Structure formats: C-alpha cells, structure tokens
Amino acid sequence: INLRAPFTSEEFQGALYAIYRHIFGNTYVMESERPTTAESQLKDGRITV
Amino acid sequence: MNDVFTRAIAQADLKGSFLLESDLDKLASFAKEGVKRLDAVAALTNNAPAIISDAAHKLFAEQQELIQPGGNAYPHRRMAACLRDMEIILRYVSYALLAGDASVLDDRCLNGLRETYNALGTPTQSVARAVQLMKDAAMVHLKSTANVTVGDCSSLYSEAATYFDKAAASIA
Amino acid sequence: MNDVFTRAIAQADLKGSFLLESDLDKLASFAKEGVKRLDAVAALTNNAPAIISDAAHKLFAEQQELIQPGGNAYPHRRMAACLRDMEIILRYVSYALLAGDASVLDDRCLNGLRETYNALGTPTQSVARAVQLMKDAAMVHLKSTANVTVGDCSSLYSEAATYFDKAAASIA
Amino acid sequence: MNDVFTRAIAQADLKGSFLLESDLDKLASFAKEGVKRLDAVAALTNNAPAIISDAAHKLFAEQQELIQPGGNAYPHRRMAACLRDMEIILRYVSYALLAGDASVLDDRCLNGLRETYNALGTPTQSVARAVQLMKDAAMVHLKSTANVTVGDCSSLYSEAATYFDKAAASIA
Amino acid sequence: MNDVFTRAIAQADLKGSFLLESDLDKLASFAKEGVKRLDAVAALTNNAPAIISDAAHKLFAEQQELIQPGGNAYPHRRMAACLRDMEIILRYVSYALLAGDASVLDDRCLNGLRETYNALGTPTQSVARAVQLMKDAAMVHLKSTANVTVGDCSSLYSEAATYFDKAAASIA
Amino acid sequence: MNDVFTRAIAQADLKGSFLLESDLDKLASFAKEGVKRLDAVAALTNNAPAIISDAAHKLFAEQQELIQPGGNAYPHRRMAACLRDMEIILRYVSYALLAGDASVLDDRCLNGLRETYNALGTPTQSVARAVQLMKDAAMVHLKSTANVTVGDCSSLYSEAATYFDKAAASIA
Amino acid sequence: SRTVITEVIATADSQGRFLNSTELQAAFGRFERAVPAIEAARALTKNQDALVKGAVQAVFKKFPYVTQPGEKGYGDSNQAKCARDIGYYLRFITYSLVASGTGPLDDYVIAGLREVNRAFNLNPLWYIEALNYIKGETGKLLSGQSKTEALLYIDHAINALS
Amino acid sequence: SRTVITEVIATADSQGRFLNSTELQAAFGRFERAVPAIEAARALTKNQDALVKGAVQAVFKKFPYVTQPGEKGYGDSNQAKCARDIGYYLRFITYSLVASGTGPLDDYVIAGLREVNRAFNLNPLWYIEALNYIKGETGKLLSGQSKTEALLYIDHAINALS
Amino acid sequence: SRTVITEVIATADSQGRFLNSTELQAAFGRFERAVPAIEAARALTKNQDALVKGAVQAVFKKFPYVTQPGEKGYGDSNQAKCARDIGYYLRFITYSLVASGTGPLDDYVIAGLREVNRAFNLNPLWYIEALNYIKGETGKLLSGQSKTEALLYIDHAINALS
Amino acid sequence: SRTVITEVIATADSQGRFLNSTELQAAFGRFERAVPAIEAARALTKNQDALVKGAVQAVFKKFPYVTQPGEKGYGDSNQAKCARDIGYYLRFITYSLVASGTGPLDDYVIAGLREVNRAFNLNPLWYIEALNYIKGETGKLLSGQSKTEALLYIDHAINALS
Ligand SMILES: CCC1=C(C)/C(=C/C2=NC(=C\c3[nH]c(/C=C4\NC(=O)[C@H](C)[C@H]4CC)c(C)c3CCC(=O)O)/C(CCC(=O)O)=C2C)NC1=O
Ligand SMILES: CCC1=C(C)/C(=C/C2=NC(=C\c3[nH]c(/C=C4\NC(=O)[C@H](C)[C@H]4CC)c(C)c3CCC(=O)O)/C(CCC(=O)O)=C2C)NC1=O
Ligand SMILES: CCC1=C(C)/C(=C/C2=NC(=C\c3[nH]c(/C=C4\NC(=O)[C@H](C)[C@H]4CC)c(C)c3CCC(=O)O)/C(CCC(=O)O)=C2C)NC1=O
Ligand SMILES: CCC1=C(C)/C(=C/C2=NC(=C\c3[nH]c(/C=C4\NC(=O)[C@H](C)[C@H]4CC)c(C)c3CCC(=O)O)/C(CCC(=O)O)=C2C)NC1=O
Ligand SMILES: CCC1=C(C)/C(=C/C2=NC(=C\c3[nH]c(/C=C4\NC(=O)[C@H](C)[C@H]4CC)c(C)c3CCC(=O)O)/C(CCC(=O)O)=C2C)NC1=O
Ligand SMILES: CCC1=C(C)/C(=C/C2=NC(=C\c3[nH]c(/C=C4\NC(=O)[C@H](C)[C@H]4CC)c(C)c3CCC(=O)O)/C(CCC(=O)O)=C2C)NC1=O
Ligand SMILES: CCC1=C(C)/C(=C/C2=NC(=C\c3[nH]c(/C=C4\NC(=O)[C@H](C)[C@H]4CC)c(C)c3CCC(=O)O)/C(CCC(=O)O)=C2C)NC1=O
Ligand SMILES: CCC1=C(C)/C(=C/C2=NC(=C\c3[nH]c(/C=C4\NC(=O)[C@H](C)[C@H]4CC)c(C)c3CCC(=O)O)/C(CCC(=O)O)=C2C)NC1=O
Ligand SMILES: CCC1=C(C)/C(=C/C2=NC(=C\c3[nH]c(/C=C4\NC(=O)[C@H](C)[C@H]4CC)c(C)c3CCC(=O)O)/C(CCC(=O)O)=C2C)NC1=O
C-alpha cells in the first residue's frame, strides 16, 4: 500500500485498514480507539504515511 | 493463494506436464458453471449481516455461559471481537467459494487461528459451533430460489458446506 | 503549549526577574477559583454532543445551500467532516478554558485551518457561524445552576466567550 | 481517479439530478465500443518497449546533444532515467486510454512533473518531443489492422492522440 | 558533495576530454601536500573541545547580551544549541579542509543554515563572530608544532582561513 | 496495569457483582492513607541516587570479582548497565509503591528478567544482592522523620519491603 | 470512484506495470454487463417518483410511532427530508448501476453514513425499510440480469446501513 | 484501566523517569476525591435494584412501542436482558467511581459498544433514557461532591452512547 | 498466482471487505473468457512438439554462430536444454492461458529471470526469437479470440525477456 | 512547559477526547496544592539574597581550592557568576513551585545542563552543595506542605545535577 498526497476515499480507507492491521499487529482496534484527528491530518496532507 | 485453476496448474507442474484433456475439461466445466458460483457468492455477501446475527443469536441462546460475567464474550470488547471473528470467517468462506479452492482458508483465515484461540483461552468448541450455525443460516440464503434463474446447485451447496466444515475442523 | 501559570513565568523570565507580589496574587486568585473553572470545563465536556447538535441544526437551518447538492456539507462524507470539525473546535475551546490560556487553541487547532478550508473550498464564514452557534449553546449550558453550588462565574463566561470568538476570528 | 462514467456521474450530482437519457445513451455507446478500447490498450501494452526504443532512437538521432558529454542524457544513469520516464508516461497514457478519461494522467503523473524537470535542469522541450515520438510510434502500432478484426476505430486513435498531446502539453 | 579530485573529474567530463597534464600535476601536488593536510586535520580534531571552549568564552565575553535572560544563548538549552552549532561548523570546516573543496562546505549545511537561523531569529552576525573565533583558535592549534615535524604549511593555513571565512560569510 | 482499586474491581467483575461494603472500606482506608503513601514514594524518588550509590559501593566491596577483568561489571559499559539496571528496578519499585499493587513491577521489570540475565551470564544471585542492598538504603530513607509529620507508617515499610523482596525473588 | 476499470488501473499502477490480460478480462466483464446495468438505470429513473412515495409510505407503515408528535417523522419538513433522502439513495443507486461499481454509493452515501446518522439521530432501519420496499418494487418492471444488478446494488446499500 | 494513578505511573514509565512532584499532586487529588466518590458508589450500590427497575420503566415509558409484539421489548427474556444491561451500566459506573477514572467504563462498556449495539440492533437511545433516569434519581440520592462525581461518570457513559 | 479471481480476492481482502459487484463482474469476465483461452491452450498443447522443434531451429537460424563448437549452442546437452527451456516457456504460457492471468509466467519464468540468465550467460535474444516463432505459428494454429489470448501471453513473455 | 494542567491537556489531546473525571481530578489536586506551593515561592522570593550569598559561601567552604588563584572560582567576575547561577537556580525553583511542575526547571535548567557544564568545566558538585545549603535553609524558612513542596523541587534539581 502506497498512499500519495491526492487520493480517493477507497484508497484512503484501504490504506487505513492496511496500516491498522500491520502497525497494531493484527490486533482488534475498536471504533472508539481509532484516531480520528490523525486520520484527518493524513487526509489533508499535513502528515505523510 | 490458489484458485482451482492455479491449483490444477501447480499439480501439473510437479509432473513437468502440460495440463491434460480431462483437466482442461474439468476447468471448462468449472468456468461454464461459474455464473451459479457468482450467484452463490453474492448470496453470501448480501446476507452476511443476517447470517452473522442469526448465528450469534442462536449461539448465545444455546450457550449462556459465553455472555455471563467471566464468559468469553462477556464485556462489549469480547463480544465485539466475537462478531468480528464471525464476519471474518464468513468473508473468507465467500472468498473460497468464489475461488473454487480452500487455499485461501488454509493460507489466510486459518493460518494460525487455532493457536490464536488456544493462547487467548477461547473455547474452540464454541467457535466451531458458531461456524456450524453460520453454515446452517447460510444454506438458507444460498438455496433461496427468488431473484435467480432456477437450476441445480447441489454441488455449490456441498462445496460451501465443505468450506464451513474445514473452518470448523481447523478451529477445533 | 502554555497555561496562565506558564505564561506568567515566561513573561517574568523574559525580564529575568522573580515573580512579583502582584503576579503571585493573580496566580493564587486563579488557583482559588480553579475549582469553579473545573465545573465550567465539565459543563462543556458533558454536553458536547448536545451543543454540536444544536449548532448543526441551527447552522443548516440558516444556510440550506450547504446541505443541498453542490454545497460543501452535502454528501455524508462532508457532513461527517463538518460535525467532526465542530467536535474538534469545541474540544480545543474546552482545553483553553481549563488551561486559562488560548495557547492550545492557537498552536494546535488553528495553526493552518484557514488555509486548509480555503484550499478545500470550505466557506470560512460558515465555519465561523458554526463556532458562534456552538458558543451560544455552550453559554446556555455553562450557566445552568443545577447540580452546582451557586456563585459568580461572569469571569468564566467571559473567558469562554473570548475563546469561542478567538476561534471564530481565526477561521474567518 | 475518474473515468467517463464517474465523470458524467460527478457532473449529474453537481446538478443534483439523475443522469439523462442522452447521457445514458452516450455511456452505453462508450461501453459498446469497449472491445475496441481493449484492443487499443493491448496494442499499447504488447508493443510498449518497441515503442519506447523507436522513440528513443529517433529522439537521439534528432537531438544529438543529449548523447554527447555535458548533454542531458549523457551519463549512463541519466540515459536510464530518460528511458524510465518514457516508459512511465506511456504506461499512464495507456491507463488513460483504458479508463476513457484523461484526468487520471494529469493527477498522478503530470501535476508534479514540470517543476521537477525545471529543478533538475532537464529541457522540457526534449521531453515533449519524446512524448510526441512515442505518440507516432504508438499510432503506427494502434493502426495495425493485423491480428484483430477489421473495423472503424478512428475515435480510439483520436482519444490516444489527445492523451499524448495533453501529456506533452503538461510537460512542456 | 564532491572532492577536489572529483571536481577535476567533473570539469573534465563537462569538457568531455581526458584529464589534462597540468590538472594531473595539480592533483599530484594535492597528494603531495596530503600529509600536510592530515596533520592539519588532526590538529583540528584533537583540539576541537578546546577550540570551541575558547571561542565560546571569547564570544560571550565580548557579547554579554547573549548571556542575559532574553538573550539567545540563554538558558542551558540555548547555550547547548549554541555550542552544538559551533561544533557542527567546526566539524564541517575540518571535512572541507581534508577534502580540499569549499563546495562540500556550501552544499553541506550553509544552504539551509542561514534561513534556519532567520526563522529562529538568531543573529547571523554573532554566528559569524563565533566562526571567526573558532578560526583563531583553530589557527593557534594548527601552527602548534609540538610532537609534529616542522615545515611550511602556508597552503593549509590559507585554505583553513578560506573555509572559515566561507562558513562565516554564508551564515551572515 | 493495575492499582488496588483496579484489582478489586477486576475481581468483582469476575464475580459479576458490585463492590461489597467491606471492600469499599478497605479502599477508603487506602485512599485515606494515600498521603503517607505519597511521602514514601517521594522518599524513594528524591533519594534514588544515594540509594543506588550505596548499594553499588557495598555490592562491589562485597564482591570484588564483579569489577575485575572477567567480572560481570568489568568495563564501563558493563558497569553502566549494572547501575542502569539498579535504577530501573528501583523506579519500578517506586511505581509499585504508588500503585499499591505489584502488577507494573511484574509486567514491566520482572517479566522475563531471570532469563535475560541467565542468557547474558549475569549472576542473578548478585543482582538479588544488589536489590537487597537497595532495599536497605531505601528503608533507611523512608523511615526518616525529617521534613514529615511523625506517624505510623509500618504498613508502608512492609509493603515496600515486599516489593523489593518480590523483585529479588523473581530475579533469583 | 471504485469501478471495475478504476480498480483495474489502480492495481496495475500499484505494481507499476502495464494493463494486461488479467485486467483486460475484468474490463471485458464490465463491458459485457454494461447493458443490463444501463437498462436497470432507465427503469429505476423512470419510476423514481412512485418508488420514493411508496418507500416513504412503507417506512411510515413499518414504524408508525415515527409519525406521532415529538418523534422524528412528525411535521411536513421532516417528511420532505424523508422523501429527499430516499431520492438521494435511489439516485446514487442509479449512478452505481451506470458506473458498474459501488463507487457512487461508497463516496456519496456509505462514507460517513454511520457518524452522520448517529449525530442527527436517524434510525438506519427507516432507510433499510425504504430500500427493502424499493427492492420489492424492483422485483417488477425489471427482468433477468438487470433486476439482478439493481438488487445487488440495493443489497450493498442495505448491508452498509446495517 | 486508566485511572489517575495508572496514567501517572504510565507517563513516568514511558518517559523512563521517577515520579516527580506534579504526578504526586495528581495522585493527591485522586486520594482526596476518593471520599465523595466512594460515598457515591456506596449510595448507588444500596439503591441498585430500585434504580434498575425505574430505569427500565422509564425506557418503556419513553419508547412505548418497543414493548409491542414483534419488537425488541416484547417477551420476558427481552425485558430481563433490559434489567441486566441497566445493572451492567450501573455496576461499571460504581466501578469508575471507586477507581477514580473512566477506566472501567472505557474498558468494559465503551470499548466495542457501537459494533455490539449495531449487530444486535439495540438502540443507544434506550440506554441514554435509562441513564438519564438514573442521573435524575441520583440527583435525589446524593448531594454535594458525591452528586457531581456520580453525574460526571453517568454522563461520560451517556456521551459514549451518543 | 496473479489471476483475475486471485487479484479480486486479494484486493478485497487487503481492504477487509466482502466481494461486491465490481469484483463479481470481473469474475464474470474471466469465466466468460475461459472458453477461448482453454481451447487455445488445448491447441497449443496438441502441437507442443512441432512448436518446440521449430522454435529451436529458428533460434539456430537467427543465431547461426551459437551452433559452432566452443560456445553455448554446441553439444547434445546444450540443445536438449534449449528444447527443455522452450518447452518450459510454452508450458507456462499454456498455464497462463488456462488460469486467465500472467500468474504462472510471472511466478515461474519472470521472477528471477535476469539473474539466472546473467549467471549462466544465456542470451534473452534466443528466447525472444523462439517466442516470436511460437507467436507466428500460434497465429495460424488459432483463430478469433483464442489467437488473441495466446498472443497476449506470448508477448508478455517476450516483453519480460526485453 | 510540562505541568499538571499541561500534562492533562496533552493526554486528552493525544487521545483526541474531552477532559473527563481523571483529568479534572488531577487538575483539582493541582489547584488544592497551589496555595502551599505559592506560599513557598513567596518565602523563597523574600529571602533572595540570604539564600544566594549563603549558598555561595557554602560552595566556597566545601571546595576551598576554587577560591585560590589559578582556579575556576578566582576573580570577582567568577564570584558574580556564582551568585548569578545560584540565583538562576532559585528563580526557576520558585517558578516550578508556582507552576506545580518541574516544567520551568526542565526547560530552563535540566535541558542542556550537562553539555554546558562540560563545555565550561563547571562542576555539578558546586551547584549540588549550594542547593543542599538552600535546602537546609528552606527547612526552617518554611513549614508544613510548603516546605515539602520546596524540598521536592530542590531535590529534583539536585537529582538532575547528580
Ligand atoms: C458488560 C457490558 C455489556 C452490555 C451493556 C451488554 C448489552 C447486551 N444486551 C444484549 C441483549 C439485549 N438487550 C436488549 C435491550 C433491552 N431489552 C429491551 O427490553 C429494552 C427495550 C431494552 C432497554 C435498553 C435487547 C432487546 C436484547 C436482546 C438482543 C437480541 O435478541 O437481538 C446483548 C446481546 C447478547 C445477549 O444475547 O445477551 C448485549 C451484548 N452486554 C455486555 O457484555
Ligand atoms: C485470518 C483472519 C483473522 C481471524 C480469523 C482473526 C481472529 C481473532 N480473534 C481474536 C480475538 C477474539 N475472538 C473472539 C471470539 C470467540 N469468542 C467466543 O465467544 C466465540 C465462540 C468466539 C467467536 C465466534 C473473542 C471473544 C476475542 C477477544 C479475546 C479477548 O478479548 O480476550 C484475535 C486476537 C485480536 C484481539 O484479541 O484483539 C484474532 C487474531 N483475526 C484475523 O486477522
Ligand atoms: C454482477 C454479479 C453477477 C451475478 C450474481 C451473475 C449471476 C447469473 N445468473 C445467471 C442465471 C442462473 N443463476 C443460477 C443460480 C441460481 N439458480 C438456483 O436458483 C440457485 C438457488 C441459485 C444459485 C445457488 C442458475 C442455475 C442460472 C442458470 C444459468 C446456467 O445454469 O447456465 C446468469 C446467466 C443468465 C442465463 O443464461 O440464464 C448469470 C450471469 N452474473 C453476474 O455478472
Ligand atoms: C488540529 C485539529 C484539526 C482540525 C481543526 C481539523 C479540521 C479539518 N477539516 C478538514 C476538511 C473539512 N472540513 C469541513 C467542515 C466545514 N465544511 C462546511 O461545509 C461546514 C460549514 C463546515 C462544517 C461545520 C468539511 C466539509 C471538510 C471536507 C472538505 C472536502 O472534503 O472537500 C480538514 C482536511 C481534510 C479532512 O481531514 O477531512 C481538516 C484538517 N483537522 C484537525 O486534525
Ligand atoms: C471531578 C472533577 C471536579 C469537579 C467538577 C469539581 C467541582 C466543585 N465545585 C465546587 C463548588 C462550586 N461550583 C461552582 C460552579 C458555578 N456555580 C454557578 O452556578 C455556575 C453556573 C457554575 C459554573 C459552571 C461554584 C461557583 C462553586 C463555589 C466555589 C467556591 O466556593 O470558591 C466544589 C467545592 C464544594 C465546597 O467545598 O463547598 C467542587 C469540588 N471538583 C472536582 O474535583
Ligand atoms: C482478453 C482481452 C480481450 C480483448 C483483447 C478483447 C477484444 C475483442 N475484439 C473483438 C473484435 C474487434 N476488434 C476490433 C479492434 C479494431 N479493429 C481494427 O483493426 C483496429 C486496429 C482495431 C482498433 C483497436 C474491432 C473493431 C472489433 C469488432 C467490434 C464488434 O464486435 O462489433 C472482440 C469480439 C470478437 C467476437 O467474439 O466475435 C473482442 C472480445 N476482448 C477481451 O476480453
Ligand atoms: C594519522 C594522521 C597522520 C599524521 C599524524 C601524520 C604525521 C606525518 N607527517 C609527515 C610529513 C610532514 N608533515 C608535516 C606537517 C607539519 N608541518 C607543521 O609543522 C604542522 C605542525 C604540521 C601541519 C599542520 C611536515 C613538516 C612533514 C615533513 C616534511 C615533508 O616531508 O614534507 C609524515 C611522513 C613522514 C614519515 O612517515 O616518514 C607523517 C607520518 N601523518 C598522517 O597521515
Ligand atoms: C576497564 C575500564 C575501567 C575503569 C577506567 C574503571 C574506573 C573505576 N574506578 C573505580 C573506583 C575508584 N577510582 C577512583 C579514582 C582514583 N582514586 C584516587 O586515588 C585518584 C584521585 C583517582 C585517580 C586519578 C576512586 C576514588 C575510586 C573509589 C570510588 C568509590 O568509592 O566507589 C570504579 C568503581 C568500582 C570499584 O573499583 O570500586 C570504577 C568503575 N573501571 C573500569 O572497569
Ligand atoms: C507534593 C506532593 C504531596 C506530598 C508529598 C504529600 C504528603 C503529605 N503528608 C502529610 C502528613 C503525613 N505524612 C506522613 C508520613 C511520614 N510520617 C512518618 O513518619 C514516615 C517517616 C513518613 C512516611 C514513610 C504522616 C504519618 C503524616 C500524618 C498524616 C496522618 O497520619 O494522617 C500530608 C497532610 C498534611 C500534614 O499533616 O502535614 C500530606 C498532604 N501530599 C502531597 O500533595
């Protein structure tokens, strides 16, 4: 998964899924634990992958 | 991962052989009957919430100890993980049904699942029961004759049952 | 990110002097009413979904072009982004209220928010109006005297209004 | 990323109305010539390195200074980078051809290219000439009526020419 | 990041010919003074804490304002950043002196160093003064011939002064 | 991670019940004595360099073989690792003192420490001796009457002793 | 949006390779299936008004309490918003049919659906009932494969709701 | 679970340093706030049965339709599960009161709440109504700091549901 | 192996989602294209010996020099290995035809091709000549679409060799 | 600057949530412990010169060689820098007392302390003995929790220097 600066919603959500599956070691992260602000910053381009 | 075609090809390569005429006939039959397979996969996909909800209701009706304090689906987190597990297994069974091969269950869905459950302490008999209940609730939507041209799909039902039973037997 | 104590220490240090008697008086005054400020922060926190719901209802009543097709809150994705932004800004106003300083409101929340909105086509006037409506609901909720000991809190109301207006001015 | 269908849908949703029967007719037309488009994409793909080699040979036989030391493509790695860039742009032209839309080329290939070459000192004129040479070679390979059913496909040639010309225009 | 031999090679390849005999003689002379230069570099490296300590003492003796609260070398964090910057500059000077090149200096830090100092607000002329004091201490160490055999080293001293001037001039 | 409160809550959740009045009384007494507990934790934290220094001096006076060539603390990197380890264990003993529970000490520090030391060749008897000597130094510092209000803190002394003893038993 | 062609090209680009048979066959399947999808789009667009009114009536039949005052569906403004939302769903189902992908539904309905519905206290069962009515009435005036496509897209929307 | 003490210790641990004055002050505030919080927990424990019955009846009063045949409130098992769930929320609220932190609620209730309510089709508004009733009743069971502690945890749970 | 079905499943699995209409239509395209591809593979299998012998002789014709003593094409073993290699290429091309994807060629021939050829001093031009041959005769052995799939796979192998 | 309130807001912000009972109780403890801390700051501020001159004399008593010619502490400028450094330390200790955290100490003293002391050959033991004198004097200049606060901050400074 490579996520550029411009991307679509499907590419973004799939990249998020891949990131959470690897970086959290295939452990379940519930909807309450998911970082919304960090996802927003990545969506805007303020931070890279 | 393998589908049926790549599995036949891999079994032919170990022989240093081209695919035989009987193998090509079997693969032509598989593809020619593929529209029914697509209908079955769509049946699993479109009714997945219903399948999981029905199986969960039955599972926690038979086994109240899973949802008691101390049970392994007790708090919201454990129950949520249980529902994630059921959805994942059903999704992978649909993958296998599309592929005509169980290689994606062996390589992905069940690759280290028994060990996961054993280390966590999850009762694998209840997991196998959940998969059996999902099989029971999925056969109904597979056999639903509405919205599809009528035909003989007994082979698809048997294949889906083998995938569900493979998952259940690899858990327990 | 600073609070009132850290800001005071910073001003003292830029001169290189110990804190003055007046400065320590003011800081002890802030500290004695800090338990009064905790209730304001708790009022903001405990009613945040209600505040955001009221602000959203009134904002999309006032400006229907946003929720119409072509508006910047039209699809579900953009509406969810709008409500999330309201959530974020109210959160940071509450942080500013507890800290006694607007440093958190400017350093992190509003560093490049206007440029983000301009590059995305978001009408910053609409966001400032959403902030003002959130401020109105927040005032309606801070002044409730139920379950609190009755006392003077015009300082806290004024300071909260200042944080809300500072956020609105930053966006607009 | 968009195609003709998604572009039309985006316009319709901007207007807030359903697609019109004329639009549906146009999209059905587009999908009826789909096999034509698949053959064009296969002509671009199957003959890609021949196209790149012919364009490179012509470009260096024309712009001789690039070969010579001190020229842009002189160092052996810079020749490698030259051919890599030509391959990438041809690949994205074939992408835009299959998609039936042009802006997918503009998004991930052309928005960041002009200032990149300017910073690197590469003459954009030579790059545009290389793109035009690939356009001519791919035009020859696409017009090839052998190996495929004979039919009128002037629209495909026009669309491929538009993609090549747009790429050259964006670079230079 | 290129060395004097690599500068000669780059110029030769830009002109497209082999290395000239005069150029070959110049590089042979550089190799002949290589041991000169290695003694100079050892003098820089071994005495680096002493050079930086002396330069800092002189710099904060002649510029007391940096010491005071509100100054730039205040508190320990900014004093440490000051000393660390001096260390990096002296390190880069030793690198360039060994290399025989000044471009290796300008491409190493000096590109971003000045505008970083500007964004911080650090006075560039004070950094130039610090570099000059480091130059004076470095000189009083390279002229030191204790436990080193004696001979002319005018080229080394001139080139070290040139590199210190280049650092102090590109910073300011 | 746990404290006395979270531990009691987890046990009650396993029982599926509310916290009993006796449990609430135990936790009320704990929170009542929390000020003494904070005094003890501060005694550990403020005097930590003295504790580690005294333990190290006594340890290497007792076992000169540990600081000789071939000893497990012979070079500076090994001695630094020894002192670092001593500080880490003291720090997790202070954390466990604050929490009122040894869960953090077990989960973080003593998790696989015996096997780590066995695989390193670190004599675990000597590590346990070091932990005992830190216990003694700490017990001297926690019993200090200066700068506190005289009172009965024998429960804290015993609890800290249990933490040290559990560390030394887990290691050896 | 996520169509067959877009997924093809995205996968090809992710490996940095050209479009080959394993992608041209997928595009071929799309082009084959385009005709039933466009026909279903015409059928769903022509009957949109009756579909929307019937779906709203189905919602009010299945959840009668919603009409009572103090509930979400009371008032002409709320019911107009109901009709508007059912029209939105139907329009994006037509878009998804045309594009042969869940891309329109995902980008315009599914993305942010749960948060938006929770914030405004919208029950997804209302929309599930409306889409079930639309599925039932799609059982008529659609025949064969076009009906299959419409039902698949509607079931995608329903599965996203629940 | 995330308490004052546990966040203090985890902060010092992730920083690789001893507990300093700031963290001791946080712990001190926790140990002080314990007296009202434990008093509130004991009061809520005494009146748990009355509170659960009242909350269930409030849920049925505000949503009269659920008890109708064919909906989630019909049958003795469903209402027993109602009483069980309200008991769960009350128990974990008292846990969070004792522990001086949202840890019991976040770990045992809030983590997974949305997925579970969505799967089993439980309306969060039922639980919000029940918790609002419990909020009102504890307004009459408690006073002073006990009241505000209990209310803060209760409406932490409420905002978790909404 | 990268085939239409396999990439469908892998892309859906990487996003943790079920198989939707897009992927099912791709699968439909594969299942429809199977008939031409399978009978093209049938035709290529039936004529393996003639194709391989013609390819070996075509390599010896376009590269006469290799036949002389002292270099690669000389000796019974070297020419038997030429025949075996060309049979390998034909076998994996038929495999790819049957599997409806470049998977078998990608995983069995193309992965590691350059390193192996470089290590054993094998010219890719020999194999390109052999595959151009096989291309020429597969032109006349096949008609219609079957010719098309066969030539996409042969040209994919040629492009991999260049 | 990292204080109780700053740590509170940092935790809440990093988890992307509002301030709840855990953070509010930590802030409550900060506010309750404010008054002894500001009391200690006032007491240490009134006694600027007594403490600083006594500390300088204590340093010159513990290390008599420093005052002799040819040593770091010979010269009126060096003595004035003694007073300046001890005054800086006392000033930041009072700042930390005011802010209820080591934030001022860490930002203005502890960060960059070791490298600066190395570069100027300033022995940390000088400052440690000065701070121990300050501690002994504060033992009687203050009583109770104000003394406890002052001692906690002076010992943090010492352990940073040791
Ligand atoms: C420890 C934290 C925890 C909570 C909070 C929790 C809630 C919970 N309640 C459930 C049952 C239920 N709960 C309710 C809700 C009540 N019943 C009706 O009488 C009222 C209208 C309504 C008032 C709120 C219903 C209707 C069910 C039946 C679920 C079903 O059959 O689909 C279930 C489904 C599993 C089961 O069969 O027991 C869960 C997960 N579970 C937990 O582990
Ligand atoms: C290959 C795809 C894949 C699968 C299949 C998978 C299963 C899986 N289930 C897990 C947890 C779990 N799984 C369950 C489910 C069990 N609870 C019982 O009541 C039921 C009978 C049964 C389910 C039907 C539970 C309760 C947990 C949580 C364990 C815990 O929280 O302690 C975990 C550990 C992650 C975590 O605990 O956060 C995995 C890896 N993960 C994957 O990436
Ligand atoms: C977009 C995704 C997609 C789907 C879902 C799809 C399904 C599909 N179903 C079809 C008919 C059919 N569908 C079925 C399957 C049904 N028959 C029984 O009722 C079973 C209960 C059930 C399967 C388990 C059968 C048996 C046919 C008859 C066509 C044949 O057997 O050749 C056909 C061929 C039309 C015909 O010749 O009659 C297709 C292409 N195609 C697609 O492109
Ligand atoms: C540092 C804290 C922080 C803030 C403040 C923040 C706001 C923020 N809002 C954004 C977009 C947005 N913001 C809004 C909200 C506005 N649009 C209008 O219609 C409404 C009047 C109004 C809602 C009240 C919308 C709709 C978008 C999406 C715009 C688009 O996709 O084109 C974006 C960029 C893309 C994204 O993530 O969605 C950011 C970074 N994010 C953060 O991490
Ligand atoms: C768990 C976190 C926490 C909270 C929330 C908290 C609040 C709190 N509010 C208090 C009184 C108070 N509460 C308020 C609140 C104001 N009264 C007006 O009606 C305004 C509407 C309202 C502004 C929100 C006031 C003015 C006082 C009196 C404070 C004083 O006497 O100085 C008190 C002291 C009661 C006493 O000893 O007399 C506390 C501890 N403490 C905590 O540790
Ligand atoms: C496996 C990948 C794949 C490919 C490659 C593909 C192309 C394709 N080309 C076809 C014929 C054709 N091919 C072309 C292409 C044109 N002819 C001219 O000579 C131009 C050089 C050229 C412009 C690109 C045309 C115009 C037709 C006839 C179109 C028709 O059937 O009406 C057909 C229909 C043959 C039949 O069944 O009777 C297909 C399926 N489809 C696929 O699924
Ligand atoms: C490991 C680093 C290194 C060192 C330490 C070093 C010392 C050194 N200096 C040498 C020549 C020399 N180097 C110098 C340089 C000196 N002129 C002034 O006195 C200055 C103090 C100083 C330069 C700053 C001189 C004068 C000679 C001898 C004259 C000559 O043969 O050119 C030689 C060669 C003579 C031999 O080995 O027989 C060595 C080894 N060489 C090295 O590669
Ligand atoms: C292999 C590398 C290595 C080094 C370099 C080393 C130095 C070293 N010297 C030590 C003892 C010591 N070393 C000294 C220093 C000397 N005593 C005075 O007469 C002089 C002024 C001064 C020398 C200039 C002192 C005073 C001690 C005792 C410190 C104590 O009480 O622990 C210690 C503490 C352990 C012990 O021996 O008790 C170390 C680690 N250790 C090593 O393993
Ligand atoms: C800044 C962080 C902070 C600290 C450090 C703190 C400690 C603290 N210690 C106190 C008294 C005390 N402290 C102690 C403990 C000591 N007495 C025994 O001799 C032992 C030697 C030793 C414990 C090992 C005792 C026994 C009391 C008397 C209070 C009581 O017995 O209830 C008090 C109550 C006021 C007083 O009576 O002086 C506090 C608040 N509180 C804070 O907010």
Ligand SMILES: CCC1=C(C)/C(=C/C2=NC(=C\c3[nH]c(/C=C4\NC(=O)[C@H](C)[C@H]4CC)c(C)c3CCC(=O)O)/C(CCC(=O)O)=C2C)NC1=O
């Ligand atoms: C394009 C995709 C899209 C959808 C689907 C969508 C749904 C949607 N419907 C809304 C209004 C509404 N919609 C309804 C629907 C109800 N009315 C009752 O008659 C029925 C039982 C039921 C419908 C089945 C209601 C009650 C509201 C008012 C909600 C409120 O503001 O309180 C709102 C909030 C309007 C605002 O900003 O104030 C949204 C976001 N919005 C979108 O941009």
Ligand SMILES: CCC1=C(C)/C(=C/C2=NC(=C\c3[nH]c(/C=C4\NC(=O)[C@H](C)[C@H]4CC)c(C)c3CCC(=O)O)/C(CCC(=O)O)=C2C)NC1=O
């Ligand atoms: C804001 C925090 C801060 C501190 C604490 C600080 C200490 C400090 N003291 C300095 C000078 C000095 N300070 C002393 C202090 C010594 N004099 C002896 O009589 C005593 C034994 C001892 C006093 C306890 C000395 C000797 C120097 C001269 C060091 C030198 O220039 O080499 C210097 C070097 C400044 C210069 O060279 O102009 C620093 C950085 N700086 C800071 O920014």
